[model samples]
Target: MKKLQIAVGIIRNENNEIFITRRAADAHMANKLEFPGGKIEMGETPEQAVVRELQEEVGITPQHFSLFEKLEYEFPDRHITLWFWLVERWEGEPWGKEGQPGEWMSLVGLNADDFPPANEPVIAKLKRL
Candidate 1:
């Protein structure tokens, strides 16, 4: 089975609203609300991956971030390890740089049903705080 490592970030604004983006309709996990992230490249730590991904996807450079959790999941085709980070400070405003729709929503408004299975724990963790 193929192994994939992913780095994800949860960025919250001063108002406590979280940043999120919609996955492409034709992608593997199609049409879901997702945190900005991507695969971890060789020689890159999860921290580097999150910073790079957020810059690419949302046009933000994280000034400060910390690992929130690390978890693994298995699918029929492959196995995935996810590293989730909490971005506490950033250099640029978060926006959908790729033209995908994005939103800054209240934490309370997030619904797990709108995300993928791998994201359930992340959402639950955030809601607990």
Candidate 2:
């Protein structure tokens, strides 16, 4: 199986809501809600990767954030490790820079059903945090 490293941004608003994006219809998780971010590039640190992904995928420049947690999951062809960061502050509105639309969900009332299978564990932790 191939190994993949991803950096995910757990964006938050002043009301402690979590920012999530719906995957494009043709995307891997098609219409599933997910935290915004993507794969870490060669020579790029997780922090750099998350920031870059946010710009490319969500159109936001993070003003404050830090690493939150890391977890691993596996599929038949891939082993994936995701580094999630809490984007506590940022400049610019977070719209989908890609084709999907974004929304903010209440932290305490987040529906885990909206996300993908790989995102389950993080979703559980996020609601508590």
Number of backbone-clashing residue pairs for each candidate, in the order shown: 0, 0
**Deviation (Å) of 98 in candidate 1:** 4.7
Model 1: residue 25 alpha-carbon error in angstroms: 9.5
Off by over 4 Å in 2: 23-32, 51-62, 95-97, 107-113
Look at candidate 2 and give me any clashing residue pairs.
none
How accurate locally, in lDDT, is each candidate? 0.63, 0.63
Per-residue lDDT of model 1, residues 60-93, tens digit only: 6554667877656778888867766766667677
Candidate 2 per-residue C-alpha lDDT over 1-129 given as tens digits, one digit per residue, 9 for 90 to 100 = 777775556677767666677654556633567765445764277655665666566576655777777667788787877776776777767642244456676756555666666676676776557
Error of 1 at 9 (Å): 2.0
- TM-score: model 2 vs. ground truth: 0.68
* Residue 123 alpha-carbon offset, candidate 2, angstroms: 2.2
